[PDB]
């Protein structure tokens, strides 16, 4: 478990490892924003 002083931030750390997947997805939205140049 996290150190006591940090356990309150568990719900953020629970979503923390998964952001790289979103980065890939963000790329597509960016290319969707410029209409797939």
């Amino acid at each position: 478990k996290l150190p006591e002083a940090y356990a309150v931030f568990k719900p953020i750390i629970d979503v923390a490892p998964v952001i790289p997947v979103f980065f890939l997805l963000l790329a597509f939205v960016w290319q969707a924003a410029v209409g797939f140049r």
Binding site: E4, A5, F9
Partner: protein, 61 residues
């Protein structure tokens, strides 16, 4: 105390949201890279200062 460190980490969290969502916008939007870099670099400095302050106050517990 634990509460003060929690407040410091939450402030770093909100500042990191601000940096993540604002630095790309300031970078890409026209006439904003050097027009308003004074906020960007000061925010980065405050971010790192918060990191060191959180480090020390965490060392106390």
């Amino acid at each position: 105390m634990v509460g003060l460190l929690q407040i410091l980490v939450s402030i770093l969290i909100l500042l990191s949201f601000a940096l993540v969502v604002g630095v790309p916008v300031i970078l890409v939007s026209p006439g904003e890279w050097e027009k308003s870099k004074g906020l960007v670099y000061s925010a980065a400095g405050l971010w790192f200062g918060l990191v060191i302050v959180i480090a020390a106050f965490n060392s106390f517990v």
